[PDB]
Amino acid sequence: AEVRALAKDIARLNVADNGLCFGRLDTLDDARLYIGRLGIFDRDNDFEP
Amino acid sequence: AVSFTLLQDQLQSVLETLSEREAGVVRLRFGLTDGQPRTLDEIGQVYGVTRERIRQIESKTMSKLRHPSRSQVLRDYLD
Amino acid sequence: ADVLVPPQKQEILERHEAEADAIERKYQRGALNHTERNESLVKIWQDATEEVGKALEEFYPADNPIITIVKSGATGNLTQTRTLAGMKGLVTNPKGEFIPRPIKSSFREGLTVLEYFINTHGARKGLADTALRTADSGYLTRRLVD
Amino acid sequence: FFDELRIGLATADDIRNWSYGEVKKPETINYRTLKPEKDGLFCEKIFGPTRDWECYCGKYKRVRFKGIICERCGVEVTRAKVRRERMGHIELA
Amino acid sequence: TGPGNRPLKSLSDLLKGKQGRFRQNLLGKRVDYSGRSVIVVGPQLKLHQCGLPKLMALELFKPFVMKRLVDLNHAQNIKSAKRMVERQRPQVWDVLE
Amino acid sequence: SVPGAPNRVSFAKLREPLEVPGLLDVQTDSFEWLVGSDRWRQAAIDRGEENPVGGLEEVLAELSPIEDFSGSMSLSFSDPRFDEVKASVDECKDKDMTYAAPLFVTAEFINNNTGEIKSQTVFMGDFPMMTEKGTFIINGTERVVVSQLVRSPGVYFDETIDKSTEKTLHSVKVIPGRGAWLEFDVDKRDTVGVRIDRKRRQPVTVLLKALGWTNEQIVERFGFSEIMMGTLEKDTTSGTDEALLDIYRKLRPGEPPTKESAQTLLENLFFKEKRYDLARVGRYKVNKKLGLNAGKPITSSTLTEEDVVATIEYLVRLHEGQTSMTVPGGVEVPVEVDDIDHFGNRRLRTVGELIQNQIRVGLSRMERVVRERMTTQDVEAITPQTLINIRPVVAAIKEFFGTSQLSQFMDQNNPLSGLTHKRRLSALGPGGLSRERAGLEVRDVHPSHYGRMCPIETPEGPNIGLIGSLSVYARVNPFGFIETPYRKVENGVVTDQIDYLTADEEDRHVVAQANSPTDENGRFTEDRVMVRKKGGEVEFVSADQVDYMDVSPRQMVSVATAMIPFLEHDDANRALMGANMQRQAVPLVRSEAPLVGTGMELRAAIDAGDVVVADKTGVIEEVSADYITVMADDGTRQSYRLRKFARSNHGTCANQRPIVDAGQRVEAGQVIADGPCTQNGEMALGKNLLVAIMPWEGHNYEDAIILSNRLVEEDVLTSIHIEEHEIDARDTKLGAEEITRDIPNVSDEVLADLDERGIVRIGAEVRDGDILVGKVTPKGETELTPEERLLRAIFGEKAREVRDTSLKVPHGESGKVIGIRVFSREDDDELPAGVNELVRVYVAQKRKISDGDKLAGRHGNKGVIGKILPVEDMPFLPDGTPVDIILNTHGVPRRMNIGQILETHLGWVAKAGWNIDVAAGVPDWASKLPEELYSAPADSTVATPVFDGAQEGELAGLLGSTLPNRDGEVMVDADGKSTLFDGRSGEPFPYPVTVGYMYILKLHHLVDDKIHARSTGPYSMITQQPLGGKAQFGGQRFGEMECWAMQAYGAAYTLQELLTIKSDDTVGRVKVYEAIVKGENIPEPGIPESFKVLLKELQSLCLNVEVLSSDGAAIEM
Amino acid sequence: LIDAEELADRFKEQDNRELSERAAADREWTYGHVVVDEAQELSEMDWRL
Amino acid sequence: CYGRSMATGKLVDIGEAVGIVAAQSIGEPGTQLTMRTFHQGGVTGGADIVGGLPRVQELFEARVPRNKAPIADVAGRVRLEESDKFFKITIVPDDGGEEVVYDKLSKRQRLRVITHEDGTEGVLSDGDHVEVGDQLMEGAADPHEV
């Protein structure tokens, strides 16, 4: 189970290498959102994307 | 099948207790190593005597051999 | 008396529960998908299990029988010791996928009803897995012998 | 033990050497009595007797006749069922 | 064909079908002079020794025991030694050693 | 609750709101339903169910009326009745009879021409009856019918991955209780098709038209989906008649294309109830899933055009990814696939339903003959007796109870084994799953098993997962689904209302955990509670979201798993092993209840039935080893005969013994006689004895066990085993065999102990090779050899034509004869055809514990006795007490079964009383302990339920409160360890050793029946190899892997002799035996018969094969 | 748990291809969505296809 | 050539059955290797590299790898180009003549990493030097091409 999970994660990372970020969106609240092939979150910043 | 071969040897071993002259009649009557059941007269022909004497030898030798002192161990060959 | 439980288990477990709650909050806001949330929770709890195992290894005295049996190489491994004393950790579904919520209890403390029930899945799976594992090995061995 | 074995084309000489007799007739056995037929595919004097130390007509029934071949019968009194290895041939037109 | 529709097996058919020779067996033989039993730890044994039960060893070595019994005059014939081994008389244990 | 219950103090801290139901109800309720007993009738009408119909009543009503083809003749059945049983259970077991009662049904013949009615009562045969224990008796043997798990007659939707294109393919199949299948699927090309009766695929529009739908109606109904419209466009069939003709020619290719049949078969295939039926459970499932007839009563179980169209719409909606569907006139229902493993889909065939199906088959066979000979006998002179042929029904019933796969010999090893056998749930069996399709996917723990099937208990054999054990609190829905109880929770306060839920309905609610803390009022004292939700997922939810709770922590476990103390601390695999090993315990000569156990052990003992319980309150008038006489308060007198030294199905002794004194008063339901393996009416599967946890000179190395010689001297682990030998005399082509004492060619030393009849006398001891029953058989032609004739002459052997075939004790068996049972057809006893007399002999032996015997605890720790030490050699406590067993330390940690250490500590605490001080208030660790546990004397048994028992802190505190010993010195310190002395050297061991009392039990894997040997013996005629198995005196297998190993060693000669001399080589075998016996060196092998015949065939093919020596030398032989 | 047929298939090639190339090489493949640009150029037979 | 006998430490004797010993030694540990999933459902398992017994079976059978990577037919310097979805690698032989071209390498596969000790080139760069038999793309080299 652990080996398959790790291999699947590595394969996903390999796929995501080509063109990680598509574009960006600006909210009316001045916030910014970045769209890409993967979800990346900062562990030490309350997981703000 | 060793018991069959051993049984054959025991026949000679038991007959060893009998005299050669009287042992020969038993061999001829029961056809030892030849198989032919020689009749009382034929044992007479090969021995050179009358036939009733062969019956007498058969009876005496048969009574001798039936004693436990001679047929001690042959009972193991029941069938 | 010899099955010592580390005194840092509580702090580690709440510290990682806070991050699991952060993951849940972000999922509720719509920044995560179901599978991605499950994967993040699995990562967090694997880290928690790793730190609990390290703390347990550090705490045990060098002459304690439970860890002396392992460190000498005579029998067992530290994962079994952690499961016995530290915490069971994560368990798999019947499909073979990790359940996001781990078994925070240790067999010294005694698993609860639901934790035990979810734990039985892997135990039942292993019985068939071991039997099926021999077929491929026999196939390759026959090829090699031929 | 032997160390190698070879096969090759068999000539009429080899077949005639192997054979102990020719199966001149196609009969197998009598219908009402199961005894083998003479010169048939189960002929006793070709392939040997069916019963140990005896022949078709039963003149000889003792082990002492090892090297004897029956007069009326022609069956060679043999040690056992040699029928398993003894074989015959056919002279075809 | 003959009776029915089944064909007649030719000579070469003795060497071709699933039944015949030139054929290997994936299943193993069953072998005489063999036994089976539970195993327990013997810590006093040396690396080249094993503990063998008396009853199992007697059955495994039966013919040798009969030979030795006949040689030592404990039995007058092979049949008597066979009966002795089967009935496990007191003396067979001295010859088994 | 039980009047005679011993006081076992309990550590439980939670109050059970519901008592454990009768554990054998799963059988008794089903059989009551089958026979329509008044008790079941009342219990069912109590549920608001009007006019319940029994199984026999249902089958008879479905069978009748039988109407003649012309309608001038009719026959009807009704009113099934049962009379008293022919004989009691014990008499039937003692006389090899079948426990059955007569069956009578009233039959009415009707003639519609002249109006004659002929009503009589017809005897339908002897119907087997179930005993009070939930078992049957057939031909003297006790048998059990296990429930079967089967897929319910619902409608099932699924999605799969195409093997070729990897696309997603959606399919549906309608599974009826009786009849043909109907299924639909969307092909990989987006074409909707239908398969009728498993036959060739065709467009669904063909079926839609065949039912009378026009193209306009199809367009209107299915216009929402483009794939359906495309299929209709590509459907090259128009009109109802043409579609009906196409379907008819599809189902009947070889029949003429008549329109009448083409219309008739479709109506008679699904929609008319003669040959199609959903069985009132398939109808319910179909109505619930498709949302049809919401709120209506179940009127008929036949299929209708509306639900077929609904199924097609459901499939089309599912393919296009819609989640919810509403049907015209129905109710909205979600659209989803079905998990066939979910117990909302699997149902349980109990014994009653299986017997009902068998009776249905028998009556179906009977109906054909009845209607056939309605047309052969003269009219108006035809009574029901003249055409009611009851042979087929009796034959079917006999076949089911004799050869069916579900009726099995009861596992009578011990009371727990039999109790757990009666509560099995078997997926394998007729109508279940295919023999070769039992893949690893079905044999897994689905979330729906919770509370209705135990996940731990299952056999170790090939049926792992395929066979399960019903949970303690579960019961069977009259539809066959397994229900389980839950407490209703409202506004966060736990209510006393209890509702039974099925796995299908449980998923619609949030269920809280059993042991969630609660206040006196019942309100939760925590903000968040652990709960199970729809997908079986466990999560944490607010206190205001829970809907239900478990009745008790023991809801998931089964009867056996409920008897393992400290089950928290044992891994699932080891818990499984312990649960199954509890079923293999052999009853001992004197049973002894465990010091530390669970409250279940009492109930499980009574519900098993092996304990005698007084029916009515009264005084014990007279008590004896054989029987107990009770005088009831009302004046009625009861007599209970105890079964003594009875042989169980597996050879174990079932001896009972009374536990009451003359003149004692016994309350109703009180236990008055202990069972085979119980003490004071509670399970006593093993013995509790003193254990020290330490390695010892390597004798307990690798899970081995060391025992004190005391256990051999005091018969602690001794057990009685009984074997049943059998023989008979049969008729033969040369005549009948005979039983005699005059067997030929045997010395008087051999037959001294034989009676006049030729059977061994009762009480005499027999050893392997001893004659039990003297038997002789006629022989054929003698044709003595010359040597044999000479032997006849020299011993005066008169001619006789018999041969000895006397029964003899098998190899390696001995004991004392305890009983003989003899049957003979001359006494009217039933025997097999061509048999005159039959004899059965019982040989009993008293097996002590010996090296190699298998022992194990309840926690899965098992081993074999590697050494039995003298009492003086065992390590002993400072007071001189020697320990009984020594278990290696290295086996506990890595196996994750530390519950055994808990059992050891608590057993030590129980053996020596404890007293918690309260002078300065209760100790902080004693707050949760009930007051009843503040003190206890020595040998005070304690109870610790599986999921609510002694805690680690409480046990640690108790360990330090034990009472002193005789001298006043505490042997075991607060850590549970003691300073042991060395028995041999005498020096004290350098460090303290854990000491306590463990409950261990003797498994039925004794070495006495596992040792095997063979030098020479019988050989199989078919393949010429040695036979196989211990019973046949066979040899050991030498597989191909062993040959590979021998080749890797380079041991050519050993392998050659193994493959030829010790195998199918007669000449070489005899030669080697002769050489060994005669002392000659072993002759060399070569040229096997197979090579000889192969060479002969090669020559026959004109191939000049020859063998040559050396590297190019001449021939040899 | 396993039969000869399933075990044999366990060791076969089991060739795998991307959905794009897999469908591009199949005439009978049915697509989930079709995008046509400059559709005025297509004839009756192209639309039929 | 075979040399020391593993079982005894002395030079192999004439007549050793080395082949069966090697077959058994290779086949015995086959149960520890990872295998294809035992579940019947799901998509084909070739997307995720199960580098275990399936890989060994692929190697021993000399079958074309499912993760094939090319190798340099000629030693020379590399000119590398990129496209929307395909790579293009050309080798110019420094001591040879005509170049060689590989112009259909899927861009999903990563370029081979070289990672010298301290130079640490990392992913293969343009202007690098590759010898005959070197591998250009991450994956398994085709035995037949080698």
Ligand SMILES: [Zn+2]
């Ligand atoms: Zn003749």
